[PDB]
Structures are given as C-alpha cells and as structure tokens.
C-alpha cells in the first residue's frame, strides 16, 4: 500500500542500473581511448564516476514533479546545498541493495549502510528521503521558499503513512529513517573535505560538474 | 562564481 | 672576447646540476607521496616537470636587473606573453647541448627514445617533437652555444610585441643593449659562420610558432582535465 | 594570477 504521493515520486526516478552501466560503458571506452601513459588512475575514475552520476543527480532533479515548477535560479540554490547528501545517498542506497581520512570517511559511510540494512530500507524510503534532501529547509534565499515548506510537511506525512502501513512491526522506523540525514549531511562534509583536499593537491579530474560544485 | 555548467543544465 | 653585457647575463643563470636534482628529486616524491591507486601518469609527471622548469625560468627573469627595472603588473606582462617560449628554447637548448640523436634528454637527466613518442603519441605531439628536433639540428649546425642561449632569452623576455606596457623604453634598451652584444660576440668568436648572427635570430619566430603549437596542445589537454592544475602552469595557460 | 605575482612580490 502506497500513498499516491509516493507513487508519483517514484515515476520521477530513473532506472539505475541502467544509468551506472551507462557510465562504466562511457568510462571503458575514455580508458580505452587513452595511451598506456596517460590511463587514469582508480582515483580519478572514481572522481569520473561521481561526475557522471551528478550529471544524472541534476537531469533527475530537473525533470522532477515540484522541483521543476521552481525559476532557475532557486533551482541552482537547492541543489548547490545538497550535491554531495545526493551522491552519498546514491551510494549508500547502492550498498544497501547489492588512506587514511578517507578510511574514516568508509567506515562512517559502512555504518550507515549497515543500519539501513537492518531496518529493510526500501525504494519508496529512498525517493521520499531524496526529496527531503533535495528540499532543504537550510537553503537561504530562495523566492519560493513555500514550495520547500510543503514538500517537507506532505513527504514527511507520506513517508510515516508509508512505514506505519507497511513495516508496521518497526514502530519507530519512520524516525529512525530521519535520524540518517544529519549523518548524510556529516558525511557528505567529510567527503566534500576529502575531495577539497586533493582538488588543492590538482589531483581531481576537472573541468567538469564535481568541481564547479566544490569550488561553489 | 556561479557553477557554468549546473546553470547551463537547468537553464536549456 | 666576451662583451661586458654578456659576462653580467651568464650571472642570472641558474647551476644546472643543482635544478636538475631539485626537480627529479621533486617528481619523485610527487609520486612516492601518493597511493598505488592515485599514481600520476607519464603525461601528469611531464606537466609538474615543465611546471617546475617554469618556476626556475621565473626566479631566472627576477634575478636580472633589467626585469627588476620593471614594475610587477610589466613583469606579468612579459612572463605571459612568452612563458611558452622559454620553454621551448630551453628545452631546444637541452638538446643541442646533452641530446643523443634518437632521444630526448629532459631536465631531469632522463632521456625518452623518439620511437616511444612515434609509437606512442597522436599526430599533434609527433608534429610538435619533429618540428622541435629539426630546429635543434639547425641549432647545433650553426654552433648555438650557452653565450648565444642567454642572449636569446633575453630577447624573448624582452619582448617588443607586448602591448600596454608602462616602461617600454626599458624593454627597448634590452633589445637595443643585447642585439648588439650578440652580434659582437658571434662576430669575435665564429668568424668562420659570416652570417651566424642573422642565422640564429632566424630561430625565433620557429620557436614562436612551435610554442603556439604546444600552447594548443596543453591547452586541448587541459580542456580534457587531464593537466595537473593549481600551479603556475594552468595559471599562464589561463593568462590573458 | 595569484602563484605568479606572489612569486614575484616576495
Ligand atoms: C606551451 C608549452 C610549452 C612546453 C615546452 C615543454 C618542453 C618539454 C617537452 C617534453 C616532452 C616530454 C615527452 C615525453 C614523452 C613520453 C612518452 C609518450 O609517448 O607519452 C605519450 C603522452 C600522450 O600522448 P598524446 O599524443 O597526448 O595522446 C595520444 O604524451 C606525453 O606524456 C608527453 C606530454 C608532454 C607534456 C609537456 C607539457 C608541456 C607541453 C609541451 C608540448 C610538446 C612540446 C614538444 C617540444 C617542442
């Protein structure tokens, strides 16, 4: 049983799967277009991965029921604040289903993952956290900032029908759930840290999205 | 600043 | 047998040794410092060697009087119009002096076999590494040696063709005060060469059109996010 | 350029 909100999210996702093969395909090929003393490293490919999920991240956002009723210009404000929430909780999600500073970062990002496990996160969990993510009440400065106040009061009531409906044996599910998105937003300020560092060291691929997103 | 590349995403 | 004027330049240059082992000492690290899973590249090393050759060509230019003679908005003037070509013509010098025909030797000490790059490297890169060794095979032909080197930097730094300079008289002098020296000291030292001066000079708008070459080519690489950022390579990439 | 004129304002 779904709230029809729910439902309605959902039709805005795209087939994941579909998306990172897409990506891995694109990746194969670039490899294979370079000589053997100009391969990237793992590092950058990973940077390379991230760019392209980001480039999926804004044409999912974009194409979003709500978001795309905002100007441009709010448009740009929301996802400035929550870029990197969304690639962590793209990747968080990912795991769920199937150094040193950056052995932090694993390790926190592992403990997450093992908690959405145990509590059988689910897909129609997962859109209504991403909008929540996506709609940020921390986001100053927007001209419709209703919109952003109404998304949080319906996808809030709907992921607690949700939840109370369909894992009515976790009787705390729904608050366990939110109780992750501080620990997003943590992480995704240790990975951005992580990522500032080496973009400082010029060892980030650039001239792309991902560091357009850091640097603003 | 202003991200060139997110603008002209959310922009077209 | 060697003008004043000369004698004074020679003193601006750096102890070869010396950059040499500070510069491959550099790139070692750059690589020892990272993990097996974020090795730089062949081509990323390359970068940080030429940005490092850069930063020496810099302390060069700021040990002359003649560049000290010019406020730091000319300075920066002058170092973007020609920072490409002083590389070049070091590189090209490099050659004359400690290359093997059949390779490249590079400011680290190492060399490169010419058929790695023939095999190896796209068209653009292969165009650029002839068009270089058929200048050094002119160069050594006409018996450039570390004297006429200098002279040739200066002239490349001093450039007339900087527009919006506020002491322009000063970069006339440097023309002025080293065309002569150097058509003294070719004309004391080779007098076996009759037009050894015209000759040499002749070397400087091939060196301008192999630097715009190469200029295109780190440009077009850059665009790919593949050239090793922050540093003063980019930055003069990014000059205007 | 930030690298360069530190380099030559030192
Ligand atoms: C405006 C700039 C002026 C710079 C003046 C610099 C002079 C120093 C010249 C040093 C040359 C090093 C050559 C070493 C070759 C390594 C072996 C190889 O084939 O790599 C292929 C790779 C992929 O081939 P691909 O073809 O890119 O891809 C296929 O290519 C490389 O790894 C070589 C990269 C060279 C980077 C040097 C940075 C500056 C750019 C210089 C342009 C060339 C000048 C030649 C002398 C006139």
Redesign the interface.
């Known amino acids: 049983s779904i709230p029809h909100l729910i439902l309605e999210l959902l039709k805005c996702e795209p087939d994941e799967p579909q998306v990172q093969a897409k990506i891995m395909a694109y990746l194969q090929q670039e490899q294979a277009n370079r000589?053997?003393?100009?391969?990237?490293?793992?590092?950058?490919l990973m940077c390379k991965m991230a760019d392209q999920t980001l480039?999926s991240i804004?044409?999912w956002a974009?194409s979003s029921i709500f978001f795309r009723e905002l100007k441009?210009d709010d448009?740009?404000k929301l996802?400035?604040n929550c870029w990197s929430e969304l690639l962590i909780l793209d990747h968080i999600y990912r795991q769920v289903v199937h150094?040193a500073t950056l052995n932090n970062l694993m390790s926190h990002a592992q403990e997450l993952v093992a908690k959405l496990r145990s509590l059988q996160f689910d897909q129609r969990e997962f859109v209504c956290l991403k909008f929540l993510v996506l709609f940020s009440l921390d986001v100053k400065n927007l001209e419709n900032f209703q919109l952003v106040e109404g998304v949080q009061e319906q996808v809030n009531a709907a992921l607690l029908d949700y939840t109370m409906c369909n894992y009515p044996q976790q009787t705390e599910k729904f608050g366990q759930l939110l109780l992750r998105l501080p620990e997003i937003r943590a992480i995704s300020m240790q990975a951005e840290e992580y990522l500032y560092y080496?973009?400082?060291?010029?060892?980030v691929?650039?001239?792309?999205?991902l560091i357009?997103?850091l640097?603003? | 600043?202003?991200?060139?590349?997110?603008?002209a995403?959310?922009?077209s």
Not at chain 1, 205 to 209: E, F, G, M, Q
């Open positions: 000589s053997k003393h100009e391969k990237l490293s793992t590092f950058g480039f804004v044409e974009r441009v448009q740009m996802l400035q150094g080496k973009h400082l060291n010029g060892d691929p650039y001239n792309n999205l357009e997103m640097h603003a | 600043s202003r991200p060139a590349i997110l603008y995403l959310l922009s």
